[PDB]
Design an enzyme around this catalytic site. Structure first.
Site, PDB file in Angstrom:
ATOM      1  N   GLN A   1      64.542 106.689  66.018  1.00 30.08           N
ATOM      2  CA  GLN A   1      64.094 107.853  65.275  1.00 30.08           C
ATOM      3  C   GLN A   1      63.660 108.983  66.189  1.00 30.08           C
ATOM      4  O   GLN A   1      63.442 108.781  67.380  1.00 30.08           O
ATOM      5  CB  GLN A   1      62.934 107.456  64.355  1.00 30.08           C
ATOM      6  CG  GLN A   1      61.707 106.936  65.103  1.00 30.08           C
ATOM      7  CD  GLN A   1      60.807 106.065  64.236  1.00 30.08           C
ATOM      8  OE1 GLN A   1      60.681 106.282  63.030  1.00 30.08           O
ATOM      9  NE2 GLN A   1      60.178 105.073  64.854  1.00 30.08           N
TER      10      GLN A   1
ATOM     11  N   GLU B   1      56.475  95.722  65.374  1.00 27.58           N
ATOM     12  CA  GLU B   1      56.930  97.111  65.331  1.00 27.58           C
ATOM     13  C   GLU B   1      58.308  97.203  65.977  1.00 27.58           C
ATOM     14  O   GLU B   1      58.504  96.730  67.097  1.00 27.58           O
ATOM     15  CB  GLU B   1      55.918  98.005  66.069  1.00 27.58           C
ATOM     16  CG  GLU B   1      56.441  99.386  66.445  1.00 27.58           C
ATOM     17  CD  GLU B   1      56.738 100.250  65.237  1.00 27.58           C
ATOM     18  OE1 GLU B   1      55.823 100.455  64.406  1.00 27.58           O
ATOM     19  OE2 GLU B   1      57.888 100.728  65.124  1.00 27.58           O
TER      20      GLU B   1
ATOM     21  N   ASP C   1      52.231  98.257  57.054  1.00 27.71           N
ATOM     22  CA  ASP C   1      51.964  99.653  57.376  1.00 27.71           C
ATOM     23  C   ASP C   1      53.309 100.340  57.579  1.00 27.71           C
ATOM     24  O   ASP C   1      53.697 100.699  58.687  1.00 27.71           O
ATOM     25  CB  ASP C   1      51.119  99.710  58.635  1.00 27.71           C
ATOM     26  CG  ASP C   1      50.776 101.114  59.049  1.00 27.71           C
ATOM     27  OD1 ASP C   1      50.953 102.062  58.256  1.00 27.71           O
ATOM     28  OD2 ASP C   1      50.330 101.267  60.192  1.00 27.71           O
TER      29      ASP C   1
ATOM     30  N   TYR D   1      49.409 113.428  53.777  1.00 28.18           N
ATOM     31  CA  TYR D   1      50.561 112.784  53.152  1.00 28.18           C
ATOM     32  C   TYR D   1      50.992 113.600  51.935  1.00 28.18           C
ATOM     33  O   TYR D   1      50.159 114.226  51.279  1.00 28.18           O
ATOM     34  CB  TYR D   1      50.258 111.339  52.757  1.00 28.18           C
ATOM     35  CG  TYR D   1      50.194 110.377  53.929  1.00 28.18           C
ATOM     36  CD1 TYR D   1      50.980 110.570  55.060  1.00 28.18           C
ATOM     37  CD2 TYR D   1      49.367 109.263  53.893  1.00 28.18           C
ATOM     38  CE1 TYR D   1      50.929 109.684  56.132  1.00 28.18           C
ATOM     39  CE2 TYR D   1      49.310 108.370  54.959  1.00 28.18           C
ATOM     40  CZ  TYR D   1      50.095 108.584  56.071  1.00 28.18           C
ATOM     41  OH  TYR D   1      50.039 107.701  57.125  1.00 28.18           O
TER      42      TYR D   1
END
Lengths: 281, 281
Positions: A32, A107, A156, A224
């Site tokens: 990303q 992750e 998360d 957000y």
């Protein structure tokens, strides 16, 4: 003099902007686009694929509620798993619990972790704790391979468009179920009640197929989209996650900035239109 | 193809944008700039001096909480005053109470009322109700001259920069106090807990100088800066406004989209950092 603006097909017709004081770092990782800037008023900001992941000013709201909700309900959590969350905010809050003996984090993008360790020190400081163990890989593979089971799992997650697209289906939630102790809890980042009740409905559907108690809670966080974000709560016992079993009085918790005993349950009191949408589910 | 963006010195370094489907109306009234557009995703939008006043998609959150909080706590409200609120959202919710016999509204800019009557019919429909009486004037003068006293006063205020600058001081709150019945309640639009805790602190200071119980509550609404806005609650009795005395079961209330009995009190459960800021006050 210029501004960062957060656009997305996930929230068409709206955008949130922050004035950029200085751009700190940019790269295209294996997975990303990564951007870190100092904002004029929200402090430092982490952006992934053009989506705001956190800012210094308000991240405590999201990380505290996601962590202390499930962790004050689990009786004596020993082994905790964080899926995603390379920034370390969840981990920071988890380390506060001296009774935890292991925190695994999965992750997929180590760049996220590395960037966070350099630019977001007060957020990624949990990585210096000996209980913390990092796994760089796909959550789906990690969950299929882990031999241990967890007291708590905190997804998360990151938004459904990108690397976290795979974290939003029926196969994924059974893997979560199997990875939990028989009295174990999962909480997962679930989208804003203002934008996609269709998604929320779907997530709750998948979850109820396995978990006996599925509840939804809301967090106020200005950076957000729509200024809030939900927590999909999954329980194996029918008691659920709305009521804490303990108070955080230890000196480790005296610095909390959002979570407390009352707003734990308050967060589950949803707007009438949402309650109505979520049953016959 | 183009976007509306909400900038302000009241929230520097941030901005919220809506995609404009078509611009419907613009004028410069005696008091402020007025803009009405159809947004691509939030329906119709009312803008005053470049500040979003409401959108069709979410106004029910603000109007329901501002109204039904004080109105479910007042035992038998007969006479209600709305300060500001030319758009009529408060009035719409108030008319739902068949026991109310008079609703006075004091709005300085009749253009706001007229525009609302034309472009926001499902919002301004309350004006067709015979109990409603409109006064085009300065709230401060209105409050100094009115002979009646009210069961409830709702200061649907508008931001401190502009015509509503005068609605944010110590002289104004004594006028409110004198205009209320001895067991009367006031609620007032009070700024976001994320942006200006200094303002919130000040308002609470002014209010406690007169009212024996001053409480603060939060509303989730995506099109206000930071996605939420506060309600300054003022009580003459020490019982305050956190607990409703009645349930809204009448067919008039079956259409509510946000407010219900539980989220009434939940709204008063504030983030730890705010609770800490608001005492020694």
């Amino acid at each position: 003099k210029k501004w960062f603006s957060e656009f997305s097909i996930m929230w068409p017709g709206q955008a949130f902007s922050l004035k950029i004081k200085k751009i700190l770092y940019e790269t295209k990782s294996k997975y990303q686009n990564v951007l870190v800037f100092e904002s004029t008023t929200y402090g430092k900001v982490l952006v992934l694929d053009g989506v705001i992941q956190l800012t210094e000013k308000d991240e405590f709201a999201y990380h505290e509620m996601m962590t202390h909700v499930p962790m004050t309900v689990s009786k004596e959590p020993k082994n905790v798993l964080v899926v995603g969350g390379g920034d370390g905010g969840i981990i920071r809050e988890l380390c506060k619990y001296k009774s935890v003996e292991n925190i695994d984090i999965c992750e997929i993008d180590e760049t996220v972790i590395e960037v966070s360790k350099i630019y977001f020190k007060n957020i990624s400081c949990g990585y210096e704790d000996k209980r913390v163990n990092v796994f760089i890989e796909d959550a789906s593979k990690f969950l299929e391979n882990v031999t241990n089971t967890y007291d708590v799992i905190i997804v998360d997650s990151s938004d459904p468009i990108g690397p976290a697209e795979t974290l939003f289906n029926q196969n994924f939630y059974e893997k979560i179920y199997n990875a939990l102790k028989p009295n174990g809890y999962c909480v997962a980042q679930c989208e804003s009640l203002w934008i996609h009740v269709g998604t929320i409905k779907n997530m709750i559907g998948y979850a109820k197929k396995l978990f006996k108690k599925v509840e939804y809670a809301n967090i106020s966080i200005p950076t957000y989209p729509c200024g809030c974000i939900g927590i999909l709560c999954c329980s194996k016992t029918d008691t659920g996650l709305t009521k804490p079993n303990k108070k955080l009085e230890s000196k480790e918790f005296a610095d909390l900035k959002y979570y407390n005993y009352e707003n734990h349950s308050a967060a589950f009191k949803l707007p009438a239109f949402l309650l109505k949408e979520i049953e016959n589910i």
